[PDB]
């Protein structure tokens, strides 16, 4: 992955790869989140949203859509998702 992301000059993908390799040892490393991030790094937002809703990552999809300043679509998404914290 690093060789492929290095043979062509890319900066965001290599940063995400560094995050993935740092989080692989400790955390669960659920492939759904990283698949959604890969899809969202392109312009295909809806495919990333579908993949993120697929397994169970509603809240993080909500939070990643909020930073794009589209609070309306993020609200449509947060109507369905829950917050299992306390």
């Amino acid at each position: 992955a690093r060789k492929c992301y290095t043979r062509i000059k890319k900066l965001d993908f290599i940063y995400l790869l560094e995050k993935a390799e740092k989080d692989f040892k400790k955390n669960t490393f659920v492939e759904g989140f990283y698949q959604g991030e890969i899809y969202a790094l392109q312009t295909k937002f809806y495919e990333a949203e579908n993949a993120l809703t697929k397994s169970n990552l509603a809240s993080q999809a909500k939070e990643m859509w909020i930073i794009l300043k589209e609070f309306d679509k993020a609200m449509r998404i947060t109507d369905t998702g829950a917050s299992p914290i306390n």
Binding site: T6, R7, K9, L11, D12, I14, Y15, A40, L41, T43, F45, I67, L68, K69, E70
Partner: protein, 133 residues
Amino acid sequence: LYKKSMQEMFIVIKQHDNDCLWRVYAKKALEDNDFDSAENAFVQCKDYASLKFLQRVRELDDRERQRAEIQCYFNKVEEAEEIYNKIERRDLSIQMRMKLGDWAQVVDQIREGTGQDVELQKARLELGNYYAE
């Protein structure tokens, strides 16, 4: 743009709403080290990678690393290296050169600089692999 302020130009560009105009507006906003206007331009352009880059940049302390990282982000690595040399602390320069994937330049930098055996050996092994590929 070069004469009037930022909000007026924003509302002026709003009617046109073109990709090139938004890109130039964001470039100017980043050049003046303004992030709010840059974030507005990037959301109006609907670019998620730019938002991620800006979020990564905003959590910085000094005034010099932000400029060098922006320069490296646009297309220019030499300017970033020069500003790194200005601020010293060359380990950031060597780490950025390793991250970008250029192995000849880091080999040139490490030679006669510090004498680190392990880093030089790893860099030479990586360069040999790159040449073999």
